[PDB]
Amino acid sequence: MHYELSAAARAAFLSKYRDFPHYMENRNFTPPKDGGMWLRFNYIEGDTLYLSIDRKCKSYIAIVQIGVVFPPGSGVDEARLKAKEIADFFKDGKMLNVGYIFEGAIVHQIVKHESGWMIPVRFTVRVDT
Amino acid sequence: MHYELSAAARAAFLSKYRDFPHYMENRNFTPPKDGGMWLRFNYIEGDTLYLSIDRKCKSYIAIVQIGVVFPPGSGVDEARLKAKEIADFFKDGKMLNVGYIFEGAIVHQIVKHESGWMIPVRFTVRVDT
Amino acid sequence: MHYELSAAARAAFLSKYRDFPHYMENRNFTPPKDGGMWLRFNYIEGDTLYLSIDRKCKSYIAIVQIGVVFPPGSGVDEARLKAKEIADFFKDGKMLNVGYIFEGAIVHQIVKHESGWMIPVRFTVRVDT
Amino acid sequence: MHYELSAAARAAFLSKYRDFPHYMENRNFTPPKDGGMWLRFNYIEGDTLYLSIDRKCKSYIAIVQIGVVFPPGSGVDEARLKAKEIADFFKDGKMLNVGYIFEGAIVHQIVKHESGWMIPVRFTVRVDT
Amino acid sequence: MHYELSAAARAAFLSKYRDFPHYMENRNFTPPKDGGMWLRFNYIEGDTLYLSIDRKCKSYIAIVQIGVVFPPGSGVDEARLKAKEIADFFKDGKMLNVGYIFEGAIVHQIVKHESGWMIPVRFTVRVDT
Amino acid sequence: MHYELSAAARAAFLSKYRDFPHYMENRNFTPPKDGGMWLRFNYIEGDTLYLSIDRKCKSYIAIVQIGVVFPPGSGVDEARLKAKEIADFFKDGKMLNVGYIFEGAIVHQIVKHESGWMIPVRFTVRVDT
Amino acid sequence: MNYSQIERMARKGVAFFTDPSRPMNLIKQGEYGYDENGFEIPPMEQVIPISGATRRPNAREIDGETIRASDILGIFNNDHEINEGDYIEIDGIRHVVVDARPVQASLEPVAYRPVLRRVSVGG
Amino acid sequence: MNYSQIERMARKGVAFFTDPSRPMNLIKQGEYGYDENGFEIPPMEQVIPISGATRRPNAREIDGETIRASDILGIFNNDHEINEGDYIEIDGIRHVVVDARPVQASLEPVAYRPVLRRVSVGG
Amino acid sequence: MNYSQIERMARKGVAFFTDPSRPMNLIKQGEYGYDENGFEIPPMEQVIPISGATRRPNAREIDGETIRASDILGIFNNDHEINEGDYIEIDGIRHVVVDARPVQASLEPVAYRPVLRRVSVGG
Amino acid sequence: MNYSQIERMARKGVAFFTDPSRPMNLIKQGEYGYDENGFEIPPMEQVIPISGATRRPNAREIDGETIRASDILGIFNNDHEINEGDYIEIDGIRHVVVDARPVQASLEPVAYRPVLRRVSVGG
Amino acid sequence: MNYSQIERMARKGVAFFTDPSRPMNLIKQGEYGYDENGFEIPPMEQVIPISGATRRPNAREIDGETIRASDILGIFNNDHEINEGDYIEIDGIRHVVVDARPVQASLEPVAYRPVLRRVSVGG
Amino acid sequence: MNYSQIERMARKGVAFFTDPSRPMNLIKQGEYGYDENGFEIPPMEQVIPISGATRRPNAREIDGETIRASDILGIFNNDHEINEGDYIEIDGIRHVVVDARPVQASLEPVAYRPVLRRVSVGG
Structure with a gap:
């Protein structure tokens, strides 16, 4: 059921940030080209x-x-504001098209390089059949 | 007796997927040649x-x-459909020619490269003598 | 909240060491240019x-x-004096602008190189919502 | 007394496979030269x-x-039949010339390469003095 | 207080060894130049x-x-003798200028190289405030 | 006290295999030059x-x-005989000049190389003060 | 620097070293998008015949598996632009251009030296 | 050595190997600071047109992701100083000069050979 | 580029550098399949005599074990095609063609420079 | 080997390749010691004007941090000896002589080719 | 090619570069076997005097231990065949031929260039 | 091969390139032994004056510690044999000859090219 779960996650993200690159x-x-976020x-x-003995509950x-x-x-303040914006749209207990959010979004530590920096933001999902 | 178990697994996979490359x-x-799945x-x-004290139960x-x-x-949706098709043919408690399935097929994380991507799908087998 | 917390910490450092390279x-x-600290x-x-079951206390x-x-x-005594001075300004249980210090400053082991040495000093912060 | 133990293991293997390369x-x-097994x-x-306090029981x-x-x-059928042949000559509780088999031969996981593939098979020995 | 502790350690070493290179x-x-120890x-x-709940005892x-x-x-008997001499001057429970020794000196394993050998000797210090 | 103990071990070996290289x-x-053991x-x-609370029993x-x-x-028969000879001269509970043998000699696994092979033999020593 | 002269000489050399019998095609993809539910829409492809020279055949090994594949470099003229990510078929086997290094002294690419890698081959 | 002679020779060579049609701009940033409450103030930027030659196009790979980017080296004369950290736009795409090696035999840089890396590309 | 001229020159040079006394054979396998129970059927093999030159003998070391083996490279003409995975026997000892680099400028391989590796030797 | 001839030729060549306008200084430290309480006494420093040529500018990268620094090599005559650990200021920025390779064929160093590294830069 | 001419020229060259005074012997081992009770039977050895030239002396280091040993290469003619695993004594010290690269253009080895490694030295 | 002629020319060249003023000594140790109680007896040393040429000064870094040392290679004639493990003092600083590569074409070493490493320097 990872098909539909990824479909729902892609649906949500596109819904809010479709325009954003x-x-x-x-x-x-x-x-x-100009170099941006x-x-x-x-x-x-x-x-x-x-989670069963009948082997029909997973x-x-x-x-x-x-x-x-x-x-x-440029500096690191705009990236943190954008990370907060993403984290405040993926709260806990949110019902997507199929499935739900097991855990919220956690802003992690920056990964640095000489050609760009990245701030990872991740969350989880779950489906019960 | 890994000979006969591998033979049975080869029998099943080929039975349903003989044509597929x-x-x-x-x-x-x-x-x-054209590049495909x-x-x-x-x-x-x-x-x-x-699993005995007589050393005659293994x-x-x-x-x-x-x-x-x-x-x-190309993109990743067709690969997930094929993985679901594979996993829905190797369910739990399926009795092959010799031996049975201890655990079902689990769709794992993509392994990436610049010349092809792969989705690992694996399951287990068992036989009692 | 990391955005705000980061700002608070930056403010404190600037308040005291604003006039420092x-x-x-x-x-x-x-x-x-001359080579200094x-x-x-x-x-x-x-x-x-x-830290809750309502999922609204983070x-x-x-x-x-x-x-x-x-x-x-040059030698290593002035660096230790500066580390002590920094550590005696970031004591435990301190009111920052938003949040507080969970653990005070710790003077760690020197990191050596052939073009400069560094003495790491670190502390922790915490906010409750 | 590893000397006599290895001598006895060499005693047995050659007994059954002194001709096979x-x-x-x-x-x-x-x-x-042909390239084979x-x-x-x-x-x-x-x-x-x-296993004592007198330090005279080892x-x-x-x-x-x-x-x-x-x-x-070539393919894999002869390797597994030969592995079975090896495993059926190294059962449990076999009294060699000096020593015995603590654990029998089990067929391990295939180790692959581009110029030869091998199937490790191993067992254990023991002597009490 | 690492300042004064390192000062005391340097004091003791110099007190007894201000001549040896x-x-x-x-x-x-x-x-x-000649090559020596x-x-x-x-x-x-x-x-x-x-070590407190008032956060004022470290x-x-x-x-x-x-x-x-x-x-x-050269050969290794002089190095071990000098290591013993060093370890017999930094015994446990010795009051330095500021603080004390928590654990004595232990002679460690030789670190080898083709241009010189080194035998590490180390001990610990502690101060209470 | 590692100094004297090392000397004792050196004495026993030389007292037995002084002729060997x-x-x-x-x-x-x-x-x-010819190439040997x-x-x-x-x-x-x-x-x-x-092993005390007064910190003066070490x-x-x-x-x-x-x-x-x-x-x-050459082959591996002489190396194992020499390993047995070494192991039978370093038994348990043997009192050296300044110390005793805690644990005896254990013949370890061969360390292979293309220019020579080695069989490690290890035993432990202890001194109480 | 009459770049036109350099371009004409490069084209003449590439035409000198190429084999007309070898059929090579250039494949480019179109736009890709997603529907309102999150599923995708496959993109269209266009086939453009090309010609050029090749060099440096090099094989591939995959963890000892008995999989046979090869990689090869090529040289082409500035007729059809070759961006990274396109697909070029040397003789029917499809190669993906990981890198397409152009002769860089002007606005026009003058010439291309793409690096082709065999496609559908696992890591 | 009459460094002036070397300077004029280098300038004439760079003018020989350059292409006037290619538009290249140099971007430099101004002062940066922080307010009394810990937040920052963005710095101003200045755009200075430049011209020069380029060499050595090189591609980039990121963990097998399908992201296309390239790196490039350049040669420039002694008109505007090029310190490390500036931004140079080759043809619209912005490149950050990680290293700007000057011809090092005198006080004046004589010539610059910056190393340009594509910006906004993840590690 | 009269490739025929290149082909004949390469053939003449190779034939100049070979030794006729050395017996070399090319071995190719047939089709392989599986029965209705999962077991396999062996594939047939065909032996084709060949001739050519060799170069670069190189030894092999395996974890310090006293196993002696060697690898050799070869040069051949475009008489019998040499795909990767085939077996070539230099003087009785069978070598597997890990890579067979052809002279790549045309449809026909013109010449082959296979890389032969000793078979049945452990890693 | 009239080393005097080699020395004078090397001095003439170096003086030919230097730029007189560039101000460079050599800084050497004095004795260091410790008091009776374990603290230290800072050592004195002496500045000696020098002149020479430089070569090979090279940049530095530190864990992706935006810190800009560079390293340069130098060539000098046998006027003031340059031991390792001394500080040489190229144009205001202080460089530490990690290695000072001399022309090694005699007692006198004849010439120096020190390796200068930027000081106070992080690891 | 008249491989006989190549053989005689190589022999003449090796004789030119060799030193007659240096005594070198080649040692080959016989058959090995095991008795019915597992124990082994030592093999016999044969000593064959040889002569040739040497090149490339190299030292060896073992984990910083004060152990002195050296490795060296050699050149020999096609009088006595030199298979890998044999023992060659350069001047009293025994060297094991890990690799014996022959001149590979014919059935006969023409000449040998063995790689000799010092024996009884731990890795 | 009149090795005597080669020896004479090598000695003439080494004498041409050396500096007589440089004082260099060769130090060799004697026999070592142990008494009945396991303790050792120090070995005697002998000092033999030598002369030669040097080349390739190279410095050493130890985990960022401020320890200054250098390594250097040398060339010597076949007057006093130079085995591995001996000590050679270049100008008062003692260097241990880790490797002493001789010219290998004859029984006599003809010439030596020792590799000298600074002694009493930690790993």
Whole structure:
């Protein structure tokens, strides 16, 4: 059921940030020419628990990672505001099209480089069948 | 008795996916010319438990890995559909020719590269003597 | 809340060491020409606990690191005096603008190189919502 | 007393496989010119336990590893039949000339390469003094 | 308080060894011309415990490492004798100028190289406030 | 007290295998010209226990490693006989000049190389003060 | 620097070293999008015949698996622009241009030296 | 050495190898600061047109992600000083000069050979 | 580029550098399949005599074990195509063609420079 | 080997390649000691004007931080000896002589080729 | 090619560069076997005097231990075949031929360039 | 091969490139032994004056510690044999010859090219 879960997550993100420059998986993307803040969307799978004896009750868990990438030299305040904006749209106990949010969005530590910096933001999902 | 277990797994996979382009162990394979979705079949052995005091009661466990390989640039939805199709044919408690399925097929995390992406799907087998 | 917490910490450092060679994050800094002791300011984020069952009581922790950099050849006593002076300004249970200090400053082990040495000093922050 | 233990293990293997191409330790071996299945004999030492307070009651444990190698391209049926042949000559509770088999031979996981594939098979030995 | 603790350690070492070629931190040293046994002095810091609920009772621990370096080719009996001499001057429960010794000197394993050998000797310090 | 203890161990070995070629630490050595079995003598220190509350009851433990090195191509029968000879001269509860043998000699696993092979032999020593 | 002269000489050289019999096509994809539910819409592709020279065949090894594939470099003229990510078929096997290094001294690419990698081959 | 002669030779060479049609701009940032409450004030930027030659196009790979970017080196004369950290736009895409190696034999830089890296690309 | 001229020159040079006395054979395998129970059927093999030159003998070391083996490179003409994975016997000892680099300027391979590796040798 | 001839030729060549306008100074430290209580006494420093040529400017990267620094190599004559650990200021910025390779064929150093590294820069 | 001419020229060159005074012997081992009770039987050895030239002396380091040993390469003619695993004594010290690269253009080895490694030295 | 001629020319060249004023000594140790109680007896040393040329000064770094040392290579004639492990003092600083590569074409070493490393320097 990872198909529909990823579909729902892609649906939500596109709904709010469709205009904002973003990267989708396995599609050829070109970073902005002037150099700016785009968003990297990644969907990481997890485990499927077997919560029964009949072997007919299982749940799926996946991790969604949204990364804010900004040019080096500008400074780090706008990236934090954007991370807060993303984190305040993916709260706990939110019912997507199919499934729900097991855990909220946690702003993590910056990953630095000489050609761009990234602030990872990730959350989880869950479906019970 | 890993011989007969691998034979049974090969029997099942080929039974349903004989036509689909696939790679079998230790045989010279050429990826599709146009570039498409082939299936990599791997059989990973495990441990042999001694569940007795007479030393005449032992069982074998093996792990079977089917990997969907697709070209970069196309996108990731068809690969997930094929993974779901694979996982819905290898359910729990399925009795093969010799041996049974201890655990079902779990769709794992994408392994990326610049010349192809792969989705690992694996399940377990067991036989009691 | 990391955005606000970061600002508060930055304010305190600036309030006392405003007139000191230092490196603010993501801004182009040039080390002193004659060769001297500057201060490196780094803000490392952490985890956000869910200390409730209503899922509406969260706390944030971040780690702030101030590093004293001094040239090789001078000797190590002035760096220790500066580290002591910094540590005696970031005591436990201190009212910042928003939040407080969970743990005080810790003078850590020197990091050596052939072009400069650094003595890391770090402390923690905490806010409750 | 690992000397006599290795001598006894060498006693047995040759008894059943003195003709099949093989490799003995520290002696110059040349793989078959045609290219086929040879056997690699390795003897790995272990622990010497002290099962007393008088310090005059000790036992020695060693691991014997025989590995069957087959050329790339042939396929895997003869390797597994040969592994069964090896495992059915190294059962539990076999009294060698000096020593006994603590644990029997189990077939391990395939180790693959581009110029040869091997199936490790190993068992254990023991003497009490 | 690492300032005064390192000061006391340097005081003791100098008191008894102000003649033997020696290396102090962050000062340009030249190994002996003829080739001989010098002493490398290093001061490694540690943690500061909070042994109270008032947050006003802390203890500081540091590790001092004295390493005897001796040329290759000579032989090792002089190095061990000098290590014993060093360890018999830094016994447990010794009151330095500020603070005391928490654990005595232990002779460690030789670190080898093709241009010199070193035998590390280390001990700990502690101060209560 | 590692100094005297090392001397005692050195004495016993020389008292028995003085004729054989051997390597002493820090002192230059040339392997046999023809090519044969030389012996590598190493002394590894350990921990220093404090078995008292008055902090004046301390004991030392060290690990001694003697290794048989033999040329590649000859075979492995002489090395094991020499290992047995070494192990039967370093039994448990043997009182040296200044100390005793805590644990006896354990013949370890062969360390292979293309220019020579080694069989490590290790035993422990102890002194109580 | 009569770049026109350099362009004409490069084109003449590439035409000198190429084999007309070898059929090579350039494939480019169109726009991609997503529906209102999150599912995708496949993009269209266009096939443009091309010609040029090749160099440096190089093979691939995958964890000891018996999978046979090869990589190859190419040289082309400035007729059809070759961006990174496109697909070029040398003789029917599809190669993805990971890097397309152009001769860089002017606005026009003058010439291309793409780096082609075999597609649908696992890591 | 008559460094002036070397300077004029280098300038004439760079003018020979450059393409006038290619538009290149140099962007430099101003002062930065922080207010009394800990927040920052954005710095101003200045755009200075420049011209020069380029060399060595090189691609970039990021963990197998399908992100396309390239890096490039350049050669410039001694008209405007080029310190490290500035931004140079080759043809619209912004490049950050990580290293700007000058011809080092005198007080004046004589010539610049900056190393340009594509900006806003993740690690 | 009269590739025919290049082909004939390459053939003449190779034939100049070979030794006729050395017996070399090319071995190719047939189709492989599986029965209705999962077991496999062996594939057939065909032996084709060949001739060529060799170069670069190189030894092999395996974890210090006393196993002796060697690898050699070869040069051949465009008489019998040499795909990767085939087996070539230099003088009785079978070598597997890990990579067979052809002279790449045309449809026909013109010449082959296979990389031969000793078979049945452990890693 | 009339080393005097080699020395004078090297001095002439170096003086040919330097720029007199560039101000460079050599800084050496004095004795250091410790008091009877364990504290230290700072050492005195002496400045000596020098002149020479430079080569190979190279940048520095530190964990992706926006810190700009550079390292340069130098060539000098045998007027003032340059031991390792001394400080040389190229144009105001202080460089530490990590290594000072002399022309090694005689007692006198003949010439120096020190390796200068930027000081007070992080690890 | 008249490989005989190449052989005689190589032999003449090796004789030119060799030193007659240096005594070198080649040692080859016989058959090895195991008795019915597992124990082994030592193999016999044969000593064959040889002569040739040497090149490239190299030292060896072992974990910083004060152990002195050296490795060296050699050149020999096609009088006695030199397979890998044999023992060659340069001047009393025994060297094991890890790799014996022959001149590979014919059935006969023409010449040998063995790689000799010092024996009884731990890795 | 009149090795005597080669030896004479090598000696003439080494004498041409050396500096007589530089004082260099060769130090060799004697026999070592142990008494009945396990303690050792120090070995005697002998000092033999030598002369030669040097090349390639190279410095050393130790974990960022401010320790200054250097390494240097040398060339010497076949007057006093130079084995590995001996000590050579260049100008008062003692260097240990880790490797002493001789010219290998004859029984006599002809010439030596020792590799000298600074002694009493920690790893």
